[PDB]
From a paper:
The vast majority of IAV use a glycan with a terminal N-acetylneuraminic acid (NeuAc) as their receptor, although some strains use N-glycolylneuraminic acid (NeuGc) instead. The high NeuGc content in horses may explain why equine H7N7 viruses are the only known IAV that bind α2,3-linked NeuGc.
The electron density for the ligand 3′-GcLN could be fitted well for all three monosaccharides. H7eq binds 3′-GcLN mainly through NeuGc-1, but the interactions extend over the 220-loop with hydrogen bonds between Gal-2 and the main-chain carbonyl oxygen of G225 and between GlcNAc-3 and the side chain of Q222. The NeuGc-Gal bond of 3′-GcLN in the H7eq complex adopts a cis conformation, which is consistent with our previous findings for the structure of 3′-GcLN in complex with the A/Vietnam/1203/2004 H5N1 Y161A mutant that shifts receptor specificity from NeuAc to NeuGc. In the H7eq 3′-GcLN structure, the 1-hydroxyl group of NeuGc-1 forms a hydrogen bond with the main-chain nitrogen of E135 and the E135 side chain makes a salt bridge with R144. In the complex structure of H7eq with 3′-GcLN, R193 forms a hydrogen bond with NeuGc-1. Despite these similarities in RBS structures, we found that H7tu bound solely to α2,3-linked NeuAc on the glycan array, whereas H7eq bound exclusively to α2,3-linked NeuGc. The WT H7eq HA was previously shown to bind NeuGc on the glycan array, and here we showed that this WT HA also specifically bound horse erythrocytes and tracheal epithelium. After the introduction of the five reciprocal mutations (T128S, V130I, E135A, A189T, R189K), the equine HA still seemed specific for NeuGc on the glycan array but started to bind to chicken erythrocytes and tracheal epithelium, while binding to equine tracheal epithelium was decreased.
Author numbering:
A (entry chain B), B (entry chain B), C (entry chain B): 1 to 170
D (entry chain A), E (entry chain A), F (entry chain A): 11 to 141, 143 to 158, 158A, 158B, 159 to 263, 265 to 276, 276A, 277 to 324
Amino acid sequence: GLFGAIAGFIENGWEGLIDGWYGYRHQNAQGEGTAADYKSTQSAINQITGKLNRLIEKTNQQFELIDNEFNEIEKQIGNVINWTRDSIIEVWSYNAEFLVAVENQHTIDLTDSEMNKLYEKVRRQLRENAEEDGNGCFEIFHQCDNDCMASIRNNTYDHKKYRKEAIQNR
Amino acid sequence: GLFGAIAGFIENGWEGLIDGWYGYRHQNAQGEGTAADYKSTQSAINQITGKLNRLIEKTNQQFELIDNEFNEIEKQIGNVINWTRDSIIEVWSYNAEFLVAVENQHTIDLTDSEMNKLYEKVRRQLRENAEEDGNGCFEIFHQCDNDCMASIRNNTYDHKKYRKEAIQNR
Amino acid sequence: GLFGAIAGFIENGWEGLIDGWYGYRHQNAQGEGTAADYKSTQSAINQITGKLNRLIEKTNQQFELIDNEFNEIEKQIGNVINWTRDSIIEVWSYNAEFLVAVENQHTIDLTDSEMNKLYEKVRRQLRENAEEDGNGCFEIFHQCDNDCMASIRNNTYDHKKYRKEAIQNR
Amino acid sequence: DKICLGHHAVSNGTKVDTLTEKGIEVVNATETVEQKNIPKICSKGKQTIDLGQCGLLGTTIGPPQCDQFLEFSANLIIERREGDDICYPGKFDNEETLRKILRKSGGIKKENMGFTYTGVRTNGETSACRRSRSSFYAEMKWLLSNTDNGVFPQMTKSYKNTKREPALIIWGIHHSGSTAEQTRLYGSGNKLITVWSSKYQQSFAPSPGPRPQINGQSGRIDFYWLMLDPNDTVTFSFNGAFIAPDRASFLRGKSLGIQSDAQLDNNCEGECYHIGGTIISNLPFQNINSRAIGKCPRYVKQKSLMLATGMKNVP
Amino acid sequence: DKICLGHHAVSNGTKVDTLTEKGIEVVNATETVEQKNIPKICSKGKQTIDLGQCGLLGTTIGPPQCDQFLEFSANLIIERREGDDICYPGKFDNEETLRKILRKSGGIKKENMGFTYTGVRTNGETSACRRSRSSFYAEMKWLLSNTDNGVFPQMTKSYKNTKREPALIIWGIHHSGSTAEQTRLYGSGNKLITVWSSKYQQSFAPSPGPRPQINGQSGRIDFYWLMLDPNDTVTFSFNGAFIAPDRASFLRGKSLGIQSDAQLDNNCEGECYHIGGTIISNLPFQNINSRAIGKCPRYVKQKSLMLATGMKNVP
Amino acid sequence: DKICLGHHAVSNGTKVDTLTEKGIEVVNATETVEQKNIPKICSKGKQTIDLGQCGLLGTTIGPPQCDQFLEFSANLIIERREGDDICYPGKFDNEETLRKILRKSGGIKKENMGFTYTGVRTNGETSACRRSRSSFYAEMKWLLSNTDNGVFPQMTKSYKNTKREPALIIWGIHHSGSTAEQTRLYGSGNKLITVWSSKYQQSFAPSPGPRPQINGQSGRIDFYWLMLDPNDTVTFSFNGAFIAPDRASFLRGKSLGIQSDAQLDNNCEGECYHIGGTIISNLPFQNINSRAIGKCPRYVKQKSLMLATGMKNVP
Ligand SMILES: CC(=O)N[C@@H]1[C@@H](O)[C@H](O[C@@H]2O[C@H](CO)[C@H](O)[C@H](O[C@]3(C(=O)O)C[C@H](O)[C@@H](NC(=O)CO)[C@H]([C@H](O)[C@H](O)CO)O3)[C@H]2O)[C@@H](CO)O[C@H]1O
Ligand SMILES: CC(=O)N[C@@H]1[C@@H](O)[C@H](O[C@@H]2O[C@H](CO)[C@H](O)[C@H](O[C@]3(C(=O)O)C[C@H](O)[C@@H](NC(=O)CO)[C@H]([C@H](O)[C@H](O)CO)O3)[C@H]2O)[C@@H](CO)O[C@H]1O
Ligand SMILES: CC(=O)N[C@@H]1[C@@H](O)[C@H](O[C@@H]2O[C@H](CO)[C@H](O)[C@H](O[C@]3(C(=O)O)C[C@H](O)[C@@H](NC(=O)CO)[C@H]([C@H](O)[C@H](O)CO)O3)[C@H]2O)[C@@H](CO)O[C@H]1O
Ligand SMILES: *[C@@H]1O[C@H](CO)[C@@H](O[C@@H]2O[C@H](CO)[C@@H](O[C@@H]3O[C@H](CO)[C@@H](O)[C@H](O)[C@@H]3O)[C@H](O)[C@H]2NC(C)=O)[C@H](O)[C@H]1NC(C)=O
Ligand SMILES: *[C@@H]1O[C@H](CO)[C@@H](O[C@@H]2O[C@H](CO)[C@@H](O[C@@H]3O[C@H](CO)[C@@H](O)[C@H](O)[C@@H]3O)[C@H](O)[C@H]2NC(C)=O)[C@H](O)[C@H]1NC(C)=O
Ligand SMILES: *[C@@H]1O[C@H](CO)[C@@H](O[C@@H]2O[C@H](CO)[C@@H](O[C@@H]3O[C@H](CO)[C@@H](O)[C@H](O)[C@@H]3O)[C@H](O)[C@H]2NC(C)=O)[C@H](O)[C@H]1NC(C)=O
Ligand SMILES: *[C@@H]1O[C@H](CO)[C@@H](O)[C@H](O)[C@H]1NC(C)=O
Ligand SMILES: *[C@@H]1O[C@H](CO)[C@@H](O)[C@H](O)[C@H]1NC(C)=O
Ligand SMILES: *[C@@H]1O[C@H](CO)[C@@H](O)[C@H](O)[C@H]1NC(C)=O
């Protein structure tokens, strides 16, 4: 991916995370917990759904028979029809392949991006009270209980509250 | 957007910024000021103009009448013409829609990117003398007057000058 | 580029780097050295090769003569053939141009991305023992000999080893 | 101590292609190329006509196998492989053009053209067209000399289209299996048929002689047709070897014509048809039949094109 | 204290679509599908011919409505809905092929073919073709027997093309409204017309009899044509029912032919035309008329496709 | 002290285009539009026939220039600009359709149709078709009256196709250069030729008279053809002016037919051909010849489309 989060600085995914697409894994005095992030999960899902919405949208263009499988039409017109049909088939086969390749590149990149955007949001939240491990983890200097961790996930963590001890705990 | 700057960590735009596309909003002892960044604004504009340049570039391929609205042509050829025309119309309608969707995704992403690139340039400039708020603002530890702020905008701010007091003002 | 590394915060390329696509340039007590990064170079190369692989993949669709350069065919069918051929030529010319433009945008962006991803990997490695210059260089606080530098390149640098002196050397 | 950011994964991921990589694994993906065929003609909510043994062109002239379809209404018309337009052997001029017209006609209704005859018989018949016994095309009159080898008087018959829609007018030229048979049916001498309207003019002469037998017959009846505009008049002038129309056909509305081997099914609903049945799909592409008609996905050469609906899968 | 990074916005943003989202708002956008029609034929800088009542094929044979266009030069040729090729009723064989040739001809110039006649009249005339009185096609000669019911001598006329460009050669076959009229114009007996060149050969016979009246006439004159190569010779051999060419046509250069209802306007410049006027645009796509000709944007089904020319709009 | 991140570059970069920028410089790039033509027909691994002076249709009837190609087998058939189908002047009806059939035939094999003649000569000849002296089409018989101006008896000849593949059947109608010549070759009176099969019927009459001379001749022989289904029978009935087939043609398999000015080269291998030679390429696009045939890149209007194979070049 372009952002190097998924299959990058984050070594692998969690098969146990069955609650969402992106999530948090925390360690404190009271142990370990894993929770899904709703907003990021929903952003990715909705983006992909928008792609599906665009692709399953049918055209209402009718086509009629131009030739005949039971009794062969005149060859002069027959040869032109066949040439034209083969040319159109080549165009659509090319179009389909290119569409799906572009969509797939971008789908992987947008999902990678969304992972990156969540990581970055957390880093900015933990202004100076923590630093980056490098495998997508934040080592928190100050002690941070289940309620402090929930404060990070619910996006209300107050940096200046725990500032003092964290920076002292350099 | 892929970079999460526009409609992301930057909560909204400034309707008052009528001087450019990207800009600076500062607060110091002497009050508040807002100024446009020329280079970033010009980078985005020029990229978009390049897209327009490509799209308004006409082909010089002539087409002639193949059928007749006043007196219907023979049906054998007429049916083939209609089938071929309908097929080509489907191809172009598909092509046009896909083009515009891809161009629009990328246009939003490049504009988001340009915002991100300017933010990041400033952060690297303010090496250790400031830290990230999280709503696209830099809280400067040392006091920074209108001339110091202009030094950031004109891209000549000397980090090591104000280093001492800023880091002391942790 | 979307990531602002290549032709961005990195001012220019090194013509002397004939060993790879991305690399390291270091300065210490023992002098200067330049070495290529294999993994990043290989990631970019392999991505581009994948694009080439897709484009040189021939179709096995045969076409036969529908008209005649030595003795002109009947004009009724001739005019339809010409109209159809010109329409198909327009479609393919459009397709080819759009393909190459999209591929080229993305190729530049993925190469820019790969540069960014390597820079970021190093920054996370040098947790607090160094800070960002701004021209793609890391100013290392602690002294770092050829073996310490190789430890960065081979991706085994221990941050907590040199932590003490580096942070003291703020 | 620590808070870590991550993403979901699965052991059983799905391969897709991108611009940069073939067979990259993702958490979920959907197929964009339809491969599922329904081996039926799904006709729910449509008025269908299954022609069976009746050839579509047969509906206009009426060999015995088309007696039940002389006037039909449909919005879906199904031609079958066993369909035959004729009973006495021969062919329609410009046959595929007429098929294309009839396929989208909405069906046909018939009206008497008002021709009556004196000085000739009207009851030509053949074992090739069987009802209770030897018979002929229901919509046509096989005109003959009153007696074997008798004089066939020079005749002229005219029909004006007084409807606001065009009339489909059919006539036949009979090529006898021998000169002796021609002279017997119609009397000796050169036979000439001339047909005109305001904008159409053509002359016809039989070439009598033995063709290979079809349905027991060495002669041939070749059928010609025109669409007669409102207020235009068709004139037939002839001295024998002429198969006259008794009724004209008028088109009823709109329809889709298909050719299919597949069995009708009034329970499933569909819009895209081909020889092997119905393609029921919301996908933009299909790899079932490049000649499918109605409202269809676009035919592509590829078997599969998987669209990624998830992130890269990293177990 | 603080320095903040941001971007511009507006309250009145414009909706666009992306691969991922329908109706996302951006600061600015431009339309890529042309909907603006100019209800004129913009002909600035072009030599135009507005045919009006003259049908394009009429220019070659010269019914009275085409007297002013017998020799014309143009790079834009406009056919009109009221255009009529004929005066005495009939039709051109392979008519649309000839229209396609004439549309791109750059106009035509005429040359006498040098035929003179003895033993027949040359001044056949009809109330269907009116000048000061009953008249005929200006470029053609209606050949008749010297007297009512008189003998029409077997004749042969030949024309060699001695120019370096092909000659357009037209002739007519006259189908009289009755046998009695045919015998009166040309004398009794079978009429045969044969025409050949080095590579062309065809024979013709009239089928006389009453067609519905057009322009008061129950007969028909059907026109046939060929392009005679340099140094090739066309030969006409006939005994009546023959409408002879007096002059041959030569093509002048290059042109675009259009069909239009729209009024000429010499003040606006344009390259893309259709029935309803001129499409003047730099946009790649148009949704006005799928049959527009000249140098045109590509026709698409969609009404609008907005191209984003700004960032996402966040008020 | 310091560690710096960077990327490679070169002074001599290559320009490419993107969606956003024209002529951006990159480290490396490859062309996607083929401009390299090989001025040869690369035929390695293919059975070729270089027709030269023999026109493809000539192979079926056998003017002297086609004597070496009366039965040929090929998977690549090359028509040449000097190719001529005929010796005595004339043309094939529906000629391009027959060329398309023969181009993909894999070649032809011939079989005697078994016609023998009594009461007429079989040895019509002309200086237009030269072997040791005046001669004729090798596969055909020019049937004539036993003596100058003699009676040509009414004749009928029939051939049943007893093979499992269709038979290509050719016949000719001779248009004499004058009535006097027609009466001399075939005797006086009207000439009529009728041809039928189970599904085909057509009648022919010569129009004698002087055409411009080709190969010294003012007459013409026009050739007609049909594909005779297995078990179908073709019947010819005639009283003169008839060029009879001696042998029927059968198609052998599969082939590609090309038209080329380029010299054969058995050393290079190729799949895409045109007038000027062979396009040998792995690129998806080509700008050499829009009418190239075989397995070819797609023709595009552009001269060059450079695909970037490196990062932006920043010296
Ligand atoms: C082996 C072979 O080729 N045999 C043919 C004969 O088939 C052919 O005679 C025709 O044979 C028919 C069945 O094979 C049938 O018996 C034909 O008779 C009828 C018919 O039913 O079609 C009898 C009808 O009474 C007659 N109708 C009238 O005369 C007017 O209503 C028709 C009519 O004459 C023909 O259909 C017109 O073509 O024929 C029988 O003629 C025989 C003569 O052609 O030649 C043998 O070689
Ligand atoms: C109601 C109905 O159908 N009536 C037709 C008559 O229309 C028809 O007679 C023709 O009527 C014409 C106007 O309607 C016109 O009067 C025809 O006369 C002329 C003509 O002007 O066309 C008179 C010319 O003198 C004559 N020219 C010559 O003979 C040689 O220059 C021509 C010429 O004979 C015809 O145009 C060739 O078709 O005719 C008049 O004939 C009538 C006879 O067909 O039949 C009625 O039923
Ligand atoms: C200047 C001009 O137009 N001259 C033509 C003459 O060309 C033409 O006479 C024909 O001239 C031919 C060479 O130019 C050739 O001599 C024709 O004679 C032959 C032939 O070789 O083709 C002689 C054959 O013996 C004869 N074959 C038979 O009769 C049966 O085998 C054929 C045959 O008659 C024709 O090919 C059929 O068209 O002709 C010679 O006829 C002359 C007569 O048309 O008219 C001059 O104006
Ligand atoms: C135009 O293209 C169509 C294909 O859409 C060609 O029709 C196909 O022709 C082939 C060869 O004649 C048919 O295959 C053959 O089938 C018969 C009987 O089943 C068998 O004897 C042969 O061994 C072979 O399998 C094929 O069925 C037929 N397809 C369709 C859909 O009709 C057609 O010939 C082309 N027209 C021209 C003028 O080239
Ligand atoms: C091929 O496609 C063209 C459309 O490009 C078909 O021409 C269209 O035919 C319809 C139906 O005949 C015309 O509409 C009708 O107009 C008449 C008179 O205005 C009216 O009586 C009917 O109620 C109906 O509105 C339509 O105008 C015409 N369009 C054009 C541009 O000519 C054509 O029929 C198709 N050809 C074949 C062989 O299917
Ligand atoms: C359909 O398109 C083809 C092009 O693919 C047209 O064929 C081209 O016609 C032009 C004009 O007749 C030819 O150019 C001329 O060549 C002759 C002799 O070399 C010369 O005298 C003229 O000055 C001019 O250069 C051109 O060679 C020919 N191209 C091919 C490939 O055959 C064709 O006319 C179009 N058909 C219709 C019905 O419009
Ligand atoms: C046909 O002729 C009658 C004669 O009165 C007229 O009422 C009708 O409107 C005409 N229809 C057309 C389509 O010309
Ligand atoms: C036509 O014939 C004359 C006879 O001398 C000759 O000058 C001219 O070049 C010929 N033109 C063509 C096109 O063959
Ligand atoms: C043709 O007729 C013979 C007659 O016995 C038969 O064996 C053969 O199978 C028939 N072939 C076809 C193609 O109908």
